[PDB]
């Protein structure tokens, strides 16, 4: 299977206070499993899935200190970028950092990531070759030059090809029962009058893992409709996901429309239509 380990890091400078708000969330696939928050009563690296609670206190001690060390680096980097851009201290800015590895079914590395954004726009990113960088303006050009001079690429490449892959393998073994599973969706269509001559048909998918899913609607014999109301796939809160797709159809011609549901846990799609009570 395709599997990924990713860490999402956000630092938010505070005008008036000196220490920024620092958040790290860790994900295997779509399942979050660790968290660090600056603004906790005692800022520690904490479990967010029960299967990571299989790690001894040395794991939690190393990860807490490294999270804490990262926060001190992200405080400095935020100060560096304040000067690069000639900005003032009485306004808030953010530095975001995503990194981690996609591994394939054989368990070999497919893509590694190490990318950052300032104020939510691309800043610097590590290229797919894991050896060169892409910058986006004058300021990231300086950062890129700094990083070329200290061979930052080979330090990140080392992480992504080694520990990221090996740690991902360990987590997939600790959380095998919940991470290496496919829960197919359960699906139905609901019916809601929208006007006099019209009706809203909504195709529900519920209770599925992983998160990736596709819903299509079509008028039978016609190509798929792009004219469609979608919601973002959303978490149920229990580890599964939900989604719906809606379409507005003429009163009386409901049964001429068909929903399809595609998911990794479905050898064939589900095929649903409105079924009157």
């Amino acid at each position: 299977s395709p599997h990924s380990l990713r860490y999402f890091t956000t630092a938010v400078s505070r005008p008036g206070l000196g220490e920024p708000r620092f958040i790290i969330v860790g994900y295997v696939d779509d399942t979050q499993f660790v968290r660090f928050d600056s603004d906790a009563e005692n800022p520690r690296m904490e479990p967010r899935a029960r299967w990571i609670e299989q790690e001894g206190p040395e794991y939690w001690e190393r990860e807490t200190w490294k999270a804490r060390d990262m926060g001190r680096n992200f405080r400095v980097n935020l100060r560096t970028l304040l000067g690069y851009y000639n900005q003032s201290n009485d306004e808030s800015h953010t530095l975001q950092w995503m990194y981690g590895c996609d591994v394939g079914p054989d368990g070999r590395l497919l893509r590694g990531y190490c990318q950052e954004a300032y104020d939510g726009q691309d800043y610097i990113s590590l290229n797919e070759d894991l050896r060169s960088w892409t910058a986006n303006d004058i300021a990231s050009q300086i950062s890129k030059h700094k990083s070329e001079a200290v061979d930052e690429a080979h330090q990140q490449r080392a992480y992504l090809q080694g520990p990221c892959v090996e740690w991902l393998h360990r987590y997939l073994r600790l959380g095998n029962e919940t991470l290496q599973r496919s829960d197919p969706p359960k699906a139905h269509v609901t019916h809601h009058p929208r006007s006099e001559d019209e009706v809203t048909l909504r195709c529900w998918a519920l209770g599925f893992y992983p998160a990736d899913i596709t819903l299509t609607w079509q008028l039978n014999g016609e190509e798929l409709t792009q004219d469609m109301e979608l919601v973002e796939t959303r978490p149920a809160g229990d580890g599964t996901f939900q989604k719906w797709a809606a379409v507005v159809v003429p009163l009386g011609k409901e049964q001429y429309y068909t929903c399809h549901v595609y998911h990794e846990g479905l050898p064939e799609p589900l095929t649903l239509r409105w079924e009157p009570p």
Partner: peptide, 9 residues
Amino acid sequence: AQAERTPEL
């Protein structure tokens, strides 16, 4: 487990 280094910007 987290990376050891972040780039110095």
